[PDB]
Design a protein around this ligand. Sequence first.
Ligand code: NA
Lengths: 26, 249
Amino acid sequence: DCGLRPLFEKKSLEDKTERELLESYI
Amino acid sequence: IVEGSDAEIGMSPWQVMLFRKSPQELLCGASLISDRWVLTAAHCLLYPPWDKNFTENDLLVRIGKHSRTRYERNIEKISMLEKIYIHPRYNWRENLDRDIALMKLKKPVAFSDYIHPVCLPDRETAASLLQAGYKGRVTGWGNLKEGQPSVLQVVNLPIVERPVCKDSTRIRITDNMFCAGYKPDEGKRGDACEGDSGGPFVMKSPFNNRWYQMGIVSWGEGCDRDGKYGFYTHVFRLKKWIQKVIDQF
Ligand code: NA
């Protein structure tokens, strides 16, 4: 259940800055 | 939060606001880790050098809020506290080592599009994500500059190397803390600030796309100063205590 947001991950939608975080993993 | 921006609706549904009951005054942030358990910083509750020792009846939480300007019908929820548990080795005398507290809600909160728990990290996730240069996210309604916003603020910030954290400050740092922020050299800025304590430092897993709470806003020296960094309580390091409290109550 935890850490998956109803309005974002659960609807396959990205928030406006999460790509910055995921890019930082590279 | 200094140099952040307005959160989008539902962007941080684990966000919790920690209020004094009477008069109603916003004191700290907090985070939702289950339907009845909330994480915050110890010093928001207990801090003897300021004669602070809040009990359950002194406080309340609000959950699922986006704006302080307006009441959000059927969206925002209030809960009273059943019990407060402060880490038994919280060091208020020196450096805020183990600045962490758990609060059990009198009434479990119903999950919704705006209310949903964050994950606590397993070992591998902690080892994988909690590394220098990786960015997490910090959220709060605390000060915007070293007054306070109407909409939840968010800022993304890189974890910093432990030697750099250690050399940045004279306060004795411990393995139960980490630091985050941009270096002068990197151009960008941002920080948590007074009023943001207890709020979460979260990271999105590339392995399973879940959001994990890695830190709790704990302390700093000014806000957003060059060569200074915010300090967070290291959640994973204290997770056996968290689990014992939740499992044992
Ligand atoms: Na800084």
